Assembly symmetry: C7
Homo-oligomer: 268 residues x 7
């Protein structure tokens, strides 16, 4: 099954796309691995039911204690751990989705305009409205704020994930087991039931290791996201213009005339 | 499995589409997470069958009490909780579906007409039927009512969801367990059966947490829907016109001449 | 899984299509929800097997009583309830399928003819066979009968569903449990078997609630279907014609000249 | 799951196609419903194993008696009931498949020839080889026999299904239970085993009801198939010709000139 | 599930294609029905484990005896019965696959050549290289041998299937049960184990019936395959030619000029 | 399920493609049949746990002995048998994959060149660079070595498979059962555990038969692969050329002029 | 199921693509085989629960010890072994993904430029900007570093995998079993529980063998990756140029003029 999942992953700036794809793809992959393993192991929790307890009496304790997790804080995390990772995946995904609707329409029209004007310059020279436009964008700060927000939000989500994972991972090794008391209501007075059942969370060992992998990847991912902020350090015939220029570099692949001019410039 | 579900979500105004997509996509996602977890845990309820009860005698109590939930109000909600979320997803979806059939055909023809007339103005000027038409739409209130209803219905459904979730979430912490009596009919006289079986709802802890996530998202979603109502606060050669204008802004991406004129206007 | 089902629903008159889509889509959705829940709960019925009975002896009673349901009337409905809903879905679907083959071919040719003639009038005026044809259709009652039958059949099926659901829902609350006797044939003389086993239908509580949802939707759907019958109350260069006119209104989206003429008419 | 199956059905003469589609689609649908329910109930048969029998000893009787069904006639039908319905579906399908290869190639070429000749007549008149051809087909009885056979075979299969279902349905109510003896071979001498185990077929109640639905539909379908035989009772510029004429009526949707001429004829 | 399988089947000479499609499709269908039923019944074999045996001790005998089938001949067939049918399906499929690569390339080029030459004759006459070619093919026996082999192989495989099924079916009724001894190795000396366990093959009753259906179909299929051998008994401006002529008849659907000439010939 | 698998198989030289397709498709098919049966039987191994052992104590022995297979040689093969077949499928597949990248690009360009030159000769004659090229290829041995290696590797893999299967098949009949000792570590001193558990491999009987089928097919496949080596024994206006000529024969289907010239040559 | 997986694999330099495809495809295939087998065997671990322990008491030890693996080093590897292979697959995949975004855009534009210039030379000669460009690339070392890094990273990952697998494989044979103590917390004082439970990892035998297969393949893969580093040893009318030349060789298939010139050169 794992190959079926991975083959999908094997068979806007590229760096930013990779960061987003990694930030969201990795936890989803990690979550899937846990469940693929969980379904293979069967149950997430097990309790020492007394030998006198029937299979459902034992099963009752297991399910009861699974719910009792909410009635000691780490225990709560263990039960909802996959959802927290899922939350991070979604939170890391919102910057790209928000970007797709808030910035992509503006950028698409603007780039095509610039590209067409550049080709007109190339064709005319062989045979500056766009420059005045671009110079105006140098005075604008509306689009750069849109980009800063996506990276800023992603960065903050990553920090929260790193801190969260560190707290989780460091405390995980000591919270695998807890004492659950099912003596509630009428059965609080039952003497045939032990005062507490020792229950162990089976997936904690997996989640604990998975958290470390995720922590390391995000730790490596932090400086990559930081590097996107150095925009100015990132072309003859901290301004929005710098952002357009960076996008121009990413779309140079589309500029047919630029390729020709680049060879001429290189020769010269 | 969760990645299989999420990858579908990862791989009319945009803001309104996002609101609708979030309002309906989130609960469906939440419902799926519960079942993905429920199938992994196995059963939704468990009862303290006496140790003398056989596996089906124990199983009988569990299934019996599951049905007995209807014969104390929160208990009823817990059993049908996924359906209530599903109900909200459908109810939040009707405004978009109703909009698709009641408004989209009118708007499609109207926008294309306006776009074509604008291009004719652009072409002719380089070389006002539409203005008289648009001015008439300023006197019309038929289409704006259609939009108001979709947002109004969605907004009301959200409020109901927020109130419902708040009632559910606040009471959830105290209703995880209930005492079920299977002593009905002939077996009401059976002395080998305890007067009541203490049964615990296993998914309540998950649903309770899921409700909080959903509550927070809808709480954040309310002002977003409210913001759509500020239409007037939302372009040389509270009227339906304001709505057409807003749709024109959303479709500026299609206006080729507008892009050119916008650069000229910016330069000027 | 529910998201997988719902996403298909999220990702001839429109009103009639919605009515048909709702009338058939809703019960299918409801049926699917029951089974999705049923598979999660495991079994539809459970019986108090004596503690002396082995797992298959207990299982035998459960399966036996499940069949015994036919040997008190509500009990019969509970077992076949999903099929009854499925029957309604199919019965509500036949009017659309019958319409597709009995009316759609006639209407398609007729509309395209009218549309082409209207465009010829528009083109010629700028530069009445169809009127004489349409006037003849005003004297015809062959096609309107086809439409009346589809709405009439759908309406009748809805009434039957509403009555059926009301009878089912009102009686459901009292028929969750029944006394089953497996003492048949040779085992009628077995003293180790109780005279009757108290068995409870587990899905009745779900079906009972689902019936109420379906009942409410159909109750709201009845007046919508009724509204289609007010055809006459439903455009310079109770007759079949009224039906063609109504279809013309639905296909105005296709009339390019009409859009232009409508703006001119509005201006005038 | 049922919605997944039904959505495929929701999302040569039309009447004959409907008859074939119904005759084959209905039993396949019915078969699928049984298995969808059977998989939800778990087992098709259950036997009163003595309380001294272990789970496999009980399981052995169930499986043994399931096979013993062949060693009283209705019992045999119950086990193979789905296959009998499947047999009917296939048998009802052969007339259409046989028709597709034996008649469709002849009819396709013949219709297109006629259609082209009719258009040539229309074009020439505005500006009789086909008539002599058609008149010859009036003297031919080769193609009508092909059609008669498909309807005849389908009709006969339906009658057999109706008789079969009636015999099955009427006897079903009395054959739900049978006495199975596993005392064969070496274990014929085992005194710890009862002389017979009372076993009950669990799916009989479902199949019995399903047979009634199928019986009613086929009973309604019989006169529809019969109506196809009244070919003669079924268009200025019992012969194969009557069959071609009937096919011409079905393909009038394709005749562009006929539509125009029909309006002129209607006006005249 | 059965509908899912059948819908694929519902939604080179045609007769030969049908024969091949039936010869291979039927057993595959039959095999699928067995497994669809087998998965619903659970296990293929069951043994009378003593009541003192634990669930795995009982399970051990069942699995042991399932393997012991090879250590009385019919028993062997029952275990591998699906594979034998699968073998027949593959063996019946090889003639078509072999035909696809050994004959189809030759025939495709030859037919198109003939068709083009016939059209050239038609066009020229209105305004004999191919005849000399065809006359040469009358002297050739290379291609007819290719066809004879495919039918011959298919025919022989059918006879073997018919004989095999007859032997299987006739003996099946007496070999449902066998006595299995697990007293091997160290446990040959165990006195707590009975000398033999009576085990019954659960699927034999199904396979036995399925074999009869398959036998009847192949029995009807034999004369159909035989009829293909009567090639000579099978068109003005036992030779390979007879085979080309037969293929010409199958491809007359493609000959546009032939259709026109056929009407003229019929009129004349 | 088997039909689902087979339908994919039912619905570079052709002989070599068939050999490769058979050599790889057959074992994959065989492997799938084993697992389809294995999943239907449930477990691959079973051990005589003492009647005093609990279900997990019995289950422990089964799983323990399954691993103990590695701590007598045939036993090892039985556990990994599917992987060995899978290994053969992959090993038989590498020659085709290697061929696809090492030879197919060269051959594609070369054939198209030859085909174009042949058409130029045909067109010019009606109205020798390629001959000098081909004559040079007669002096080259670079491409023939590429072909020889693919057949040689495939042939060797087949021989190894035949020898392996023969060793496996011949020894299989005697190694179905083995004595497993779980008395290791602390439990080596447990007197409640028998010194050895007699365990039987359940799938050996299936694998043993499957090996014979595979052995026979490969035995028939050996001479087919050998026949490919007789290249010289395999067309007016052991050299690489012989290989190109053989490929030309396979691509004659594409040569339009050759078809025409072949008829002329045949007539002459 | 295995055929379903394999058929996907059966139905930038080619050598490098094969290396990457093998390096990543093989472990994914291996991982899938383990899980396909694991799901067929059921559980990954089993412990000698005392015969007095109930099924959940036994199940508790199994699940407990599965988690206890983290509280002797090889034991840790066995639990996470599939993830380690998955880690290698991803790590081997990053060089190709990184290459796709960091090098593929540059190479695509550069090759097409060169190809177009070569065709211009061919056309002009029959009837040196690119040479000066290429000569400049000979002085550049920017792109070769990109390639070196992908091979270097892949190579290092392979070495780590080889060392890791060797350590794992060599130690695997001695770490199949471990002694697990569940006497923690309150149950540390329970005398009814043995001081340690002997637990055996069931999948170790499979993983151990799989590691050897993977080790051998990577061992063979190492020299293949090394061979890519010998770039200089790898065409009239250690420099980046050498890399472009190597890519030119891979894309010669696209050069139509080169093919013609190659034949002329060969003839000359």
């Amino acid at each position: 099954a794992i190959a079926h999942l991975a083959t999908e992953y094997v068979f806007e700036l590229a760096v930013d796309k990779m960061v987003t794809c990694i930030a969201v793809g990795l936890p989803l992959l990690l979550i899937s691995l846990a469940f693929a393993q969980e379904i293979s192991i069967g149950t997430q929790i097990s309790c020492f039911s007394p030998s006198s307890f029937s299979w459902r009496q034992a099963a009752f304790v297991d399910s009861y204690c699974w719910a009792a997790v909410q009635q000691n804080l780490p225990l709560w995390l263990h039960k909802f751990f996959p959802y927290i990772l899922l939350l991070f995946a979604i939170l890391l995904y919102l910057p790209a989705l928000f970007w797709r609707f808030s910035a992509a329409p503006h950028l698409c029209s603007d780039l095509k305009f610039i590209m067409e004007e550049l080709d007109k310059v190339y064709n005319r020279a062989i045979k500056p409205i766009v420059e005045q436009y671009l110079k105006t964008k140098k005075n604008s700060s509306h689009l750069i704020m849109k980009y800063i927000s996506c990276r800023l939000v992603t960065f903050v989500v990553i920090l929260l994930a790193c801190i969260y994972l560190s707290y989780y991972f460091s405390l995980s090794s000591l919270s695998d087991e807890f004492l659950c008391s099912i003596k509630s209501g009428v059965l609080k007075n039952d003497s045939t039931i032990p005062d507490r059942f020792q229950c162990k969370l089976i997936a904690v060992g997996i989640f604990q290791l998975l958290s470390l992998i995720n922590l390391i990847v995000y730790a490596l991912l932090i400086p990559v996201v930081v590097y996107t902020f150095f925009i100015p350090f990132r072309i003859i015939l901290y301004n929005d213009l710098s952002l357009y220029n960076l996008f121009l570099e990413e779309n140079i692949s589309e500029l047919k005339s630029y390729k020709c001019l680049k060879v001429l410039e290189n020769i010269k």
